[PDB]
């Protein structure tokens, strides 16, 4: 609330009577050394601050409370409670200041890799993994949060995230040019869809992905893995992307730059491309 | 053949109107269908989140009934 | 030739009327599923939550009354 | 050419029509899932209430 | 000739909604996948608490 | 009714128990001790009668218990089943009388915010904007409340719910507020969903929508909006939205009313028109001079 | 096959121990008061009894161990597992024997009507109803259970569930020459069905539903309802519904059937009908 | 990689730890008689190596450690728990060794069922017959498992899943068995979709495939069978296989395999195949003479 900053001066306050807590386990816990349930409501208050600290929009003191909440309450007991505190820190964190939520973050992960929860490590490692792309420029941990991530879910037989989080990988690994990666990924990927019924529509771009890295390594290569692929799937050829890629190489052989201009342009008339293909043409077509 | 090619064109027109309502049908099916999917993982968070702590109360309780 | 003509016209007509209605009352049906589910989802949410505070306000006043007793 | 693209029309709306049947089955599953689910939550809600409080009011009166 | 781009028209929005169809499978059968986990916890955590909660009322006696 | 007749009969007999049970609680606080279970018993049995009132179709009786029965329990150090039937009486007042549905509901949103369950508290903020909105003539309460919610919404991550209420609240201040925010609500939503591949070929609707209030305004700078919406938006070029727009400023130019009329009513062929589209045209063209 | 029959076997022995233990628990209360927990554990013989009778494939045994597993439950004063219990029964009577099931799921109705909950009520409302529909010809019995739960779910506004209940009725009450309550519903659900951003397509669907039964009674009436649903509904004209009435109106004025029967032969073969309006469009023919 | 050689380090050490702890175990029973917390922390000892041992990539041993707490926490009357680290240990399994895993998992359906679950033990049931047939090729086992699934889901009105189940055994029964049992299922599942929600025209394609089965037994069979369900079912009428198969049986009846050769050729042209069908048509075709 725009006008909840009294209440909030007074949960400064009441963190402030958790100091007086502190300042009881300093001294006066000798005579109440009974009262770990007064250090469980200290840290109940902590909470509560904390939480109209959220509600006061203070993005920082409530992250701040958080972290002090998790760190009181993780007492050698009651772990859960202390992740999920460090997690709601990181949560409060990921905007203003994300630096320490990855930190927290990754307290929670071993918190729950040693208590045995995967999903939620393997999400939260997505997680630290998107805020790296989407707030700094690192790729390559994000690479390598994600290929742990993957590691966890298929450990579980989760096929189709690992999978999903694969082909994010691949792509990197494209824009990244470590060609082998891409292609082995683009390829395990589309041979595993095309294996069940429900995702046999999808095999064709996936295949028409790899041809292209393929035919971005070698060329003299690149005709007999559409033959490969021709082969291993009948109905692969009929697709428009195995028709344009033959003509595409084809073409190549001979240097006229105007037929393989006006294929990518007649392409383009029946339907926009993404930033990926087009970069990836526009380089590798230059030469 | 005139009223064939007439015949045709009200097929056309025809086809544009339900192209016209499919495309704008299946928009809505997917924002809708989008919106459920955020909210069960919010759920299927918070019942994990909710089991383990129940484990853990149980194991709790019985052990301080054990102490007695 | 404009004996060809007529026959594939008319196939081409009734074909793409029978498909398009036929997916348009498909389409239609689902429309109308997918809210009794959104719902049911709501009405099970609400209940969870009701579960998990009954039951941590339950354990906690538990945990204080046995602290209480010894 | 309007042979060639009215097959390829043929083709499209097919695969449309097909894909229709895929998902109307398993958005059913989904709901009769929902269904058990939610009856199953809505008993342990029940179970749990009236079993905590009827035991903390019996632990708690007889003192 | 507004025949041959009518027939353009059809066709993009006709291969466009199978394009977006398709993830609406995808998203459907993930959609469906944790239905049986969440079913499974719900379970397991039901069972659990029975279990405890009669264990506990049993011991009062 | 026989069935609904003695309904009401054995209404009135748990009526008559519930006021023997408030005197007992009076007597309990005053004569005797420990009344806390006994007033709990209470307000178990005003519970069931409040619920039977319910049933009988006597939704008055059933909320003016259930609120009686929620203001008697909250003397007993507890919130939540507080919250609890506030909501439930604030739903039983949802039909018939509303008006003290609004500020149970308030009080419900108070205790859960303090509480700490922010998206409850939204979706209450937002039953509470509806409810105002088809049953309260007056739109600024309700323009408020979407945007707390949506505030609540886009806080806690949530972004869909926010997006949509955003763009709702939006929409309707259009009508009757000022544009300017009317432009600056469509623009961030269609530029968040640009990049996001859901709505990112329905945008163009959101654009069109933005380019009418730049329209509407003046020329120039709907001229330049458009020119900024489709250089950033290369593909909102071809869109059927952008030679209309084109068409009608040209028309508008030129102070012809037959050429503008003329052009809205072919597109109109294309599907029709909508409540506001069409009085947002009426309103423009009216200044034509 | 012998699964079946161990299971019945030892479900046998199980029932010969479960009444000792009901003889020999009341023995024992009597004679030394050791409390009500051996109540409670010939409540759940009776629960594994009976549903190991389930797993034999005896659904009348299994279904009178529920009841009277519930019946003893509720005596031990608890109502929701007994309500669980008799439910259960319910479900195992459905098939076989459904008649005592019908007692069984309305007392469990009641039970729930007491306690106060509405939605599971409902839903047992509308079971019973298809229950009788199904089993039953007393369509009488199958209205008083739907138009009950339509008020349910109409009176927890929870308004889509309530218009399927009211279709139906209004169906079924049109096909039992009452048209007063089909008129009233349709046109109600067309109306409501106005300003639906989804349902608008198929406003006119119940309208003219409405306009074909209102045409039993006589036919300026009919065009009276017909014009004025279209100045209601303006593109209600553009549908060949009211192309199909006014053919029918225009032929029925002259005494032209055979130019009605044509007409209604030819809207068959462009799209077929269903017994119901099969039904009424003869029934009209008669006159 | 470090963290992989020292999470075995490890598990090696706390797997002797447990192991002296349970021996150390029961000697303090019978010397100190403190209870049994001493199996239970054993028991936890046990879980933790092997959810950190799997973690270290290895999984033979540490579905091992998974089976043999469940059998130490199951010989102090705690089930559900054991029963559950059983389907735990069978998911480890999976990837090691199928018998075990196969073994832990009918151990833990039966004593699921036991307790009273059916969906669950479904829900492994089917588990068990997918690996059974994905990598082991066997069918009947298979077809029984399936059945017994479908049972227990219909046992609890899950009206979906048996049909699915019910469907696929059927298909399985007519690529191998004998097709009575593939006749009456499809038919029934055909028949049981005429008011379907939202499958008012699916079951067509359940109805062609019996009528193929006809077929397979003989033309006098296919002809009446073909005839019933034109009658029973009008819609199937104008059905495009029902064209389809008037004009194979008409062919098949003059004894002229090029009309049939490019009815079928036709009909793979205009619609793409599925693998099933056409081998069906070809063992057709083999019986031309």
């Known amino acids: 609330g725009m006008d909840t900053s009294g209440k909030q001066a007074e949960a400064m306050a009441l963190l402030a009577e958790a100091e007086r807590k502190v300042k009881n386990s300093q001294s006066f816990f000798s005579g109440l050394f009974g009262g770990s349930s007064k250090i469980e409501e200290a840290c109940e208050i902590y909470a509560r601050a904390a939480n109209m600290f959220k509600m006061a929009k203070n993005w920082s003191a409530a992250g701040n409370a958080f972290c002090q909440a998790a760190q009181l309450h993780l007492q050698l007991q009651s772990k859960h409670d202390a992740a999920t505190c460090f ?6 964190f990921k905007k203003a200041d994300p630096q320490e939520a990855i930190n927290c973050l990754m307290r929670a992960i071993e918190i729950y890799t040693d208590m045995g929860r995967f999903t939620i490590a393997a999400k939260h490692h997505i997680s630290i993994a998107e805020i790296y792309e989407t707030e700094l420029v690192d790729v390559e941990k994000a690479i390598a949060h994600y290929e742990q991530s993957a ?51 999808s095999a064709k771009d996936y295949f028409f992905k790899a041809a292209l890295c393929h035919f971005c390594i070698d060329m003299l290569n690149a005709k007999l893995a559409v033959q490969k692929y021709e082969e291993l799937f009948p ?18 052989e001979e240097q006229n730059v105007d037929s393989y201009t006006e294929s990518v342009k007649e392409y383009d008339s029946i339907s926009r491309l993404d930033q990926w293909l087009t970069t990836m043409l526009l380089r590798i077509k230059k030469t | 053949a005139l009223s064939e ?64 | 030739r404009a004996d060809q003509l007529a026959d594939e016209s008319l196939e081409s ?45 339950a354990e906690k006043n538990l945990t204080d009354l046995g602290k209480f007793a010894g």
């Open chain 1, 151 to 201: 590691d966890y879910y298929k450990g579980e037989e989760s096929n189709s995230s690992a999978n999903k989080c694969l082909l994010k990988v691949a792509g990197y690994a494209a824009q990244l040019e470590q060609y082998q990666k891409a292609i082995d990924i683009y390829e395990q990927v589309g041979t595993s869809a095309m294996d069940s019924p429900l995702l046999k529509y």
């Open chain 3, 13 to 57: 007509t009734r074909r793409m009327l029978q498909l398009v209605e036929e997916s348009k009352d498909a389409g239609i049906r689902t429309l109308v599923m997918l809210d009794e589910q959104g719902e049911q989802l709501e009405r099970i949410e609400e209940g969870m939550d009701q579960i998990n505070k009954d039951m941590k306000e």
């Open chain 1, 87 to 92: 997690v709601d820190a990181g949560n409060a």
């Open chain 1, 235 to 252: 109905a692969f050829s009929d697709s428009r992307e195995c028709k344009l890629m033959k003509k595409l190489l084809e073409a190549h």
């Open chain 2, 5 to 68: 090619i007439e015949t045709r064109h009200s097929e056309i027109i025809k086809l544009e109107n339900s192209i016209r309502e499919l495309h704008d049908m299946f928009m809505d099916m997917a924002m809708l269908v989008e919106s459920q999917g955020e909210m069960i993982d919010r759920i299927e968070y918070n019942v994990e989140h909710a089991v383990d702590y129940v484990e853990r109360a149980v194991s709790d309780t019985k052990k301080a009934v054990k102490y007695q």
